Design a protein around this ligand. Structure first.
Ligand SMILES: O=C(O)[C@@](O)(COP(=O)(O)O)[C@H](O)[C@H](O)COP(=O)(O)O
Ligand SMILES: O=C(O)[C@@](O)(COP(=O)(O)O)[C@H](O)[C@H](O)COP(=O)(O)O
Ligand SMILES: O=C(O)[C@@](O)(COP(=O)(O)O)[C@H](O)[C@H](O)COP(=O)(O)O
Ligand SMILES: [Mg+2]
Ligand SMILES: [Mg+2]
Ligand SMILES: [Mg+2]
Ligand SMILES: [Mg+2]
Lengths: 465, 140, 467, 356, 140, 228
């Protein structure tokens, strides 16, 4: 075989339907919508080529190396039930293609250029099979669920959090004031809003200081370990690290990072710093829905969640199912398993396209947050079980009696539901009764229940399987 | 508007925001441990060693993050590996509180697959304790 | 009694829909293409977007009263219906400058696109444009050098710059990389580059590559007497690895590195841009993953916003699309954001997707890079679309030449200079471009061979990202 | 001395039995960070052997469970616990989590008992940089002692670590993991006494010495010989103990011998008789295998040691009366009685490979 | 299974896990000192200075490794250099405890060749001490 | 299954002849010589136990974790042809047992204590199967053969080296003198003897300097890349 200059079909090299995947290959499932007149085999082959080794015309340099060894391979194509022009194209990437420990590099190949090809109309990465041999190159999360519970000395129930509100506009001292009143009422954590970084109305270091006073006051008052996710998200790696360092020096338990808006490179650095200095790292998924909302195009959240598990985080927001932000039940249960568990079998009814073996990488604590209140508690406990953090921002700071009563109401509701489950009660059916029973001896819960009685979030789901 | 009291309103993690557990309610929690095949264990501490504190951090550089004294309590005998009898757990609660009538005592359970404590709650506080409130006095 | 705290849920529009608000010259403005769920009034949907990207949540909080919501709240101040759409609106939101961390693109995105795209109350949402006011622009370091300084340091004037991605994408050894690089640069290309996904890998570790490529740069430069560079990829898994790679480039005395700003991220990118400013390295920006975000008309963020964000975060080059090559980019859309990348002042012009007048207040312009599936026959159109202030890149269009890299580079350089000369002479490249190329073929056998191989090759498909 | 010569075709087998390290060479080494006298002085512990204990199972325990086991062991009367030699940092337990929980346990047991406690935190690592990071964390937690596997980590790393320990006042326990690959066979390799001398020069406050009576090999006379080479300032030639050369240590501090591996309460009289007070005796299985748990296990070992020590001090012959000493102590110590019952029949008696 | 008590079960290093020493057992330990030619010495401390503590570490950077307060006690007179008479040691124990009846007192001996304390045990604790257990109450 | 205190045979837990090895397990092949009266199954089990999770008596803490998940397993025993008392015992170790990137840790488990056990007379580790998932945790060699040839620009023949002699006793300048004369005659490399470090007769930095002069002299003279 000599060098022959010119354009030929991608499928001649990159469509290999008889390929048997290797246990070290990274696998991708792409929901692919080709342009009219582009065979799905060619479209799949183009995706495989331009995310691995190939370009639009034949290059002579292929001959200096072994394309068989390195090429990405479209090895299977599935039609999508109910769609005339949608296919699941499966692509295998040899492990040699990837930089060890770099989520950034993995994304750069797999989602770098292919989504903009004129030859396709839409493309969505649904899933990735990360093989143990690649998983093992990552530091992964600083601590993980088991270690987190162990350091906090908290067992037998979901954790409780709360975003301070209003989102922006509060002074540093008022932030600490709100934090102290929230924590002292029964919440384990509070947090900076994702967009609270450092601003004219409140500079970060002032906030860290006042919040630290509040954490230690509430802890001493209640006798329970308290934390507040102090935001390290910043414009530069240097500012981000300065903020992490200050939290270390204050001896406080937990910081947060917006992994998508800050980015994987910054996030991985931060996760490593957290591992080395024993800080918990809460991950906020700000901007995920720009990428993961639409069924036909983008990247499903389950891939963003796997990427975060690899890059590093002790917590990651998972959605609520029942709250103000979208997340269908089956989809959510699927990626929650992918975040927490060591081994997750293929299960298309939950959007799990590949069996995923995490080879002992620590599990990430799912955080259910956004538009939830006391009446949601039974469903949340039923959906998530104990290994989750449930967060009530407005559901605390919107309580008619203030933050401490608000926190108490949420903590009462959680513990009542937990007790009821433990006793054999069915939370899906008896949840309303559990809450109403608790209302009899908890005036804080009764007041919360009254204010939010009619409030539901029920809309047509966009991100359907 | 009721005001949540900051005096003396110490809590004790899981279930401490509920009314004090009846014997029937405790028994039900023990049934839950056994139904799930978890390992029951009792732990205890004198009042001075009951709540999280910071005294050891005097010996530290800048490494106090997630270090607290008094998270560990003292093990009563051994974890009850292989226990499939709730009555056995209840009898150990009686034996432990009898030997240490002035101690804080908590029942916990371990899962050996996740290798983590999977449940826990207080079963005894010393009668001299006055740093806590009855359910109806938590707010004023 | 005046206004007390009233617990409970009320409509967002009672606080966040302010159609009579007169925007301030320091406000950040956002244009959102919004698709509400049935039964959600567009005013309420716009108000929810404004609220949940600024100060508000789903129920009334008492803490509002400790501060001034009027001072801090985002405001949906206008709603435009979309011609040809029954359920699409442009919602305009004004954000006070106080909401943003100085110099942090990360923070700006976190507010404006953080949570609102996932709201159950909407079906789809797309950020079309942002008005970045001079008072906020001034808080950013911005690009390490910019177009004028770049040309000045390179001593290159009067034509487009020429680049080229080495191929195959992955699988080449470090020495073969430098071999390909030398052969490309010596034939007349100004630059070559690491593929976006070439970082450090088992088949080729980064430092070996940097070394061999450095030998290739200096060989080609001495041979041709023209300044040469190769964008060495600093993209990495961690900020520490990224910086180590930048440092090595600095110590080798080479001109230019690259970063994948979206896959690496804005926090890392801004750090790198600052390092490049402080050590006089050019920073080429690859927009890997942009199309995940910017392809679809109904949902995501238009590339023009991603381009503004990059200009603020910092980069000397940014890929702009080709219009005519293998990747999508409609002409009018592209011309619009190219102006937004390069110019100091760009007037509102909806016919090019420019929703807001944008004043860059002397922040340096970013060099557009046209790359992807282009060859010699595209040259007239590329020169016509972009003018001189662009870098045109031919990867396959160089390494796919039947005679090898140096002849491939020569063909591209000949085509560019012929088109440039023709334009300078008054010729119309849109009409006479084919003739210009054919004339050059008579005295350039390298060009003739390139023209023959790619004669029939075009990329013409229905456009997804339409205005 | 051992670089190339062992592989020469012209020989069938070669074993380095001994080295005479002259004072003029000894004086070029920093040597052990502290040594026996300083160690006892900083711990405020005198008049008896020290007691240690390896946490078990070797691998597979979480950080918090490690600290849990540690606290229960130390509070019952053991001076020290330790990471297993192969406990470094792993998926089931990362090092820094362990260091933190173990620190809580050390300080809890110390406050409870009123005796100084320690746990050898493993600084053994894949790189010098990781090793140092672990030592630094121990320093910053204010804890007394770390450990290093000097042969698997290596002499270059070990010497560095010993110097760090000297400069920051950390005790350095040395585990001899892999020594038996080298020192087991009579015809070929390097005898342990040379490996012990090398360690003393490179630096360590403790070194494992064998038990004689436990699960791992160590003949009595051989052991007594190298124990003297580890502890003493001047050791005369004595071929009946494998000492081929008179060795003058020229005041280099002595290294504390650590007797560990397969030993239990009934071995106590022999251990005290063999080693005397200047040794650390370690009971891993012999503590965590007690039927009543770690604290009772520790108490049984501490009772056995103190009974034997008292008996020796009173003029009793431990070689002959040891069983009687233990049985007498059983009458007032139910912890010891329970330990004695479980391990009554357990002995380790096999043909010795490493014979003189 | 008996449970080792964590309350108030403070120990005192060598021989504190044995039943309290009889006068005959103490005399035998003194005979051991003299037989070996070691230097007997008595040391004492008031209750507040008896157990290892950390208070000075407040003045430190990251240098608390193997630093503890209350390791040093107060010397009774001088080490009895040249003493070859056990009765002399016993008489000094009497004199020391008479002068300080409420103090902790320990008997130690020094070896001047190794230059180290070579033995030691407590010979007196204040009768007001209640932070320790009799042998048969150490476990419950 | 409760905690039962006391000693039992290692083979009850650690001899698993029906175990199917996982593709991520580290495998070891031990040439094992048991003491008389020790069954090879028990000896192999002891080796597996004491290089992984086990000790000489039953510990209660096993119950807090999953021994099945973590234990080393003697999964096969081969008799050695021509030997009455020699066996190849095969042990599988879960990947979870090892620190990522640490050869030190791998050796510490597999060869740390087992070679000294009284119950065996001799033991030799013949081979290890390092699985890709563990290989991937290592940085590995700085360059490797291909990169080495590429940086040296040397292809098509073996490379030539040479240890300077006498082993010890040469001065720094005489070292450089010997090096220059060696390299200029056609050797690609020379080298310090293994035991040449820094010594009274020749301190390292003096040697590095004189050798550097020699490398560059020979390189300029021959036109071939030189090293020492
Ligand atoms: O800014 C907010 O809306 C929140 O602070 C919740 O506020 P409330 O508790 O007042 O609703 C959280 O950041 C969102 O839940 C993020 O969404 P997700 O978890 O889906 O990523
Ligand atoms: O990986 C590639 O396909 C390229 O190297 C071009 O190769 P060829 O020159 O061989 O076509 C560029 O990265 C794309 O142009 C990126 O797309 P865009 O510029 O649209 O971001
Ligand atoms: O891993 C082990 O087997 C031990 O923890 C002992 O455990 P047990 O107390 O449970 O026996 C020690 O490391 C050995 O003593 C080392 O051998 P040596 O001292 O000869 O170097
Ligand atoms: Mg938020
Ligand atoms: Mg590319
Ligand atoms: Mg060990
Ligand atoms: Mg040699």
């Amino acid at each position: 075989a000599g060098f022959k200059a010119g354009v030929k079909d991608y499928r001649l090299t990159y469509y290999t339907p008889d390929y048997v995947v290797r246990d070290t290959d990274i696998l991708a499932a792409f929901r692919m919508t080709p342009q009219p007149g582009v065979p799905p085999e060619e479209c799949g082959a183009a995706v495989a080529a331009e995310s691995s080794t190939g370009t639009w015309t034949t290059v002579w340099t292929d001959g200096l190396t072994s394309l068989d060894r390195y090429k990405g391979r479209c090895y299977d194509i599935e039609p999508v039930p109910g769609e005339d022009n949608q296919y699941i194209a499966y692509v295998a990437y040899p492990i040699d293609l990837f930089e060890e420990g770099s989520v950034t590099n993995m994304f750069t190949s797999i989602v770098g250029n292919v989504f903009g090809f004129k030859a396709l109309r839409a493309l969505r990465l649904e899933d990735l099979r990360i093989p143990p041999a690649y998983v093992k190159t990552f530091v992964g999360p600083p601590h993980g669920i088991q270690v987190e519970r162990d350091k906090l000395n908290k067992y037998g129930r979901g954790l409780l959090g709360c975003t301070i509100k209003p989102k922006l506009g509060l002074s540093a001292k008022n932030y600490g004031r709100a934090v102290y009143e929230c924590l002292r009422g029964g919440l384990d954590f509070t947090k900076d809003d994702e967009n609270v970084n450092s601003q004219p109305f409140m500079r970060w270091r002032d906030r860290f200081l006042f919040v630290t006073e509040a954490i230690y006051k509430a802890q001493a008052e209640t006798g329970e370990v308290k934390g507040h996710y102090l935001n390290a998200t910043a414009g530069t790696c240097e500012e981000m690290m300065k903020r992490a360092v200050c939290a270390k020096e204050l001896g406080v338990p937990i910081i947060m990072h917006d992994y998508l808006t800050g980015g994987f490179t910054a996030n991985t650095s931060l996760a490593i710093y957290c591992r080395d200095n024993g800080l918990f790292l809460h991950i906020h998924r700000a901007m995920h829905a720009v990428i993961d909302r639409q069924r036909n195009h983008g990247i499903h959240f389950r891939v963003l969640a796997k990427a975060l598990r690899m890059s590093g985080g002790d917590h990651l927001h998972s959605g609520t199912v029942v709250g103000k932000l979208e997340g269908e039940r089956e989809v959510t249960l699927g990626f929650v398993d992918l975040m927490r568990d060591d081994y997750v079998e293929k299960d298309r009814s939950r959007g799990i396209y590949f069996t995923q073996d995490w080879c002992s990488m620590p599990g990430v604590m799912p955080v259910a947050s956004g538009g939830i209140h006391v009446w949601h508690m039974p469903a949340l406990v039923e959906i998530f079980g104990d290994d989750a953090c449930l967060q009530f921002g407005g559901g605390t700071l919107g309580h008619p009696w203030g933050n401490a009563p608000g926190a108490a109401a949420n903590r009462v509701a959680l513990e009542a539901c937990t007790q009821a489950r433990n006793e054999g009660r069915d939370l899906a059916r008896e949840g309303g009764d559990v809450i109403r029973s608790a209302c009899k001896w908890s005036p804080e819960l009764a007041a919360a229940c009254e204010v939010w009685k009619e409030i539901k979030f029920e809309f047509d789901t966009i991100d359907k399987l | 508007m009721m005001v949540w009291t900051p005096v003396n309103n110490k809590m004790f993690e899981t279930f401490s925001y509920l009314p004090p557990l009846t014997d029937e309610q405790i028994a039900a929690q023990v049934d839950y441990i056994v139904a799930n095949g978890w390992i029951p264990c009792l732990e205890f501490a004198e009042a001075d060693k009951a709540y999280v504190s910071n005294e050891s951090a005097i010996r530290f550089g800048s490494v106090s993050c997630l270090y607290y004294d008094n998270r560990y309590w003292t093990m009563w005998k051994l974890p009850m590996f292989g226990c499939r009898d709730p009555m056995q757990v209840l009898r150990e609660i009686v034996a432990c509180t009898k030997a240490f009538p002035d101690a804080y005592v908590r029942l916990v359970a371990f899962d050996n697959q996740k290798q983590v404590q999977i449940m826990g709650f207080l079963v005894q506080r010393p009668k001299s304790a006055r740093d806590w409130q009855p359910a109806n006095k938590r707010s004023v």
